[PDB]
Amino acid sequence: NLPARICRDIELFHFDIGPFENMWPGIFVYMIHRSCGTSCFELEKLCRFIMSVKKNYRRVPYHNWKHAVTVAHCMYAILQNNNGLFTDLERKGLLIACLCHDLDHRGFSNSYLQKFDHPLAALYSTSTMEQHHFSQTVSILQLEGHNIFSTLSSSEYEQVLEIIRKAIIATDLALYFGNRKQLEEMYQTGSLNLHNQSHRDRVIGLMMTACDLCSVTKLWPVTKLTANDIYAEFWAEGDEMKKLGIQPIPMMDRDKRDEVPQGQLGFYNAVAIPCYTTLTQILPPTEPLLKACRDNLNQWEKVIR
Numbered sequence: 001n002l003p004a005r006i007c008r009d010i011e012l013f014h015f016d017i018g019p020f021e022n023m024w025p026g027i028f029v030y031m032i033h034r035s036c037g038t039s040c041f042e043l044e045k046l047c048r049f050i051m052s053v054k055k056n057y058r059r060v061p062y063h064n065w066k067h068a069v070t071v072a073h074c075m076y077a078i079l080q081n082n083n084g085l086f087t088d089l090e091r092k093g094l095l096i097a098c099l100c101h102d103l104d105h106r107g108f109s110n111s112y113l114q115k116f117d118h119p120l121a122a123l124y125s126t127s128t129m130e131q132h133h134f135s136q137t138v139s140i141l142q143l144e145g146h147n148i149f150s151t152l153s154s155s156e157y158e159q160v161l162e163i164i165r166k167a168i169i170a171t172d173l174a175l176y177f178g179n180r181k182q183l184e185e186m187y188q189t190g191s192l193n194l195h196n197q198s199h200r201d202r203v204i205g206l207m208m209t210a211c212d213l214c215s216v217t218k219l220w221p222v223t224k225l226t227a228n229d230i231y232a233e234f235w236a237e238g239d240e241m242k243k244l245g246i247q248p249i250p251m252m253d254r255d256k257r258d259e260v261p262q263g264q265l266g267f268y269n270a271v272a273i274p275c276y277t278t279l280t281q282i283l284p285p286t287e288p289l290l291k292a293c294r295d296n297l298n299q300w301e302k303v304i305r
């Protein structure tokens with residue numbers, strides 16, 4: 001059972017899930033239990049599913065099992081603080097989508113897989129890794145005793161898999177820019193309609209971005225340490241690009257590491273702040289993410305001064 005400190009701190013948007021890997025499953029079960037019900041999934045089936053998901057994440061610096069549960073936690077905190085908006089089925093789906101959203105990631109971007117001519121990029125031309133993450137999700141569900149959705153009707157089953165599919169695809173950051181532009185225009189014209197399925201999908205997609213980027217909404221020590229793991233992957237990819245004979249973008253070039261703070265400024269300005277600003281306009285109870293994001297922007301500006 002969860003320690004008292006976790007029971008309290010887990011409700012904070014800026015909760016960090018800690019270094020004890022064996023606690024992460026119970027943290028996820030607790031979150032799912034509170035967001036749906038303890039008669040939401042069969043406990044034994046769910047545990048088996050969780051452990052098989054864990055096993056198909058890799059030991060990479062950032063796109064690992066810890067990131068998966070951290071992203072699920074952000075989604076938990078958004079849903080907990082926006083009660084009455086999402087159906088039981090959406091909440092179930094979104095927490096599972098978050099847990100599964102980087103399955104079998106290698107620590108390389110879609111663009112690297114494309115330049116490499118990796119077989120996955122011939123199979124899935126766009127949002128390559130994200131299509132694979134969803135394929136892995138389904139393959140795990142199809143294992144004997146791993147169908148956590150077995151009590152649902154076939155219709156509800158197809159529905160939840162489509163919720164998961166759209167939510168995982170949406171974590172392809174290339175899609176965020178267009179989605180967020182559409183959502184901002186909808187907000188300002190007063191045309192956003194949460195009862196319209198296409199708008200609803202967009203909002204869920206932004207939520208997925210916000211959860212995926214959530215390292216920038218933690219307290220500064222967490223944010224700064226998490227950035228080390230992110231760059232360990234980016235620089236490894238940059239090395240690989242150099243080995244293909246291709247000059248990497250500065251973000252992936254370890255030789256431009258002194259430009260990290262400027263690079264962070266750029267990301268906060270073009271990606272993170274607009275993401276949480278738009279999210280807060282649609283779901284005002286998510287304001288603490290935006291606030292923590294602004295505080296971290298200020299820290300990066302302080303690093304530069």
Ligand SMILES: c1ccc2nc(COc3ccc(-c4n[nH]cc4Cc4ccncc4)cc3)ccc2c1
Binds near residue numbers: 215
């Ligand atoms: C030279 C040197 C350093 C540079 N640094 C940047 C900053 O890039 C960032 C900043 C934050 C994040 C981030 N933090 N938490 C989640 C994410 C998003 C992310 C993570 C993993 N894979 C894909 C997306 C990603 C990239 C930009 C340009 C640069 C140029």
Ligand SMILES: [Mg+2]
Binds near residue numbers: 102172
């Ligand atoms: Mg991903």
Ligand SMILES: [Zn+2]
Binds near residue numbers: 067101171
């Ligand atoms: Zn992710």
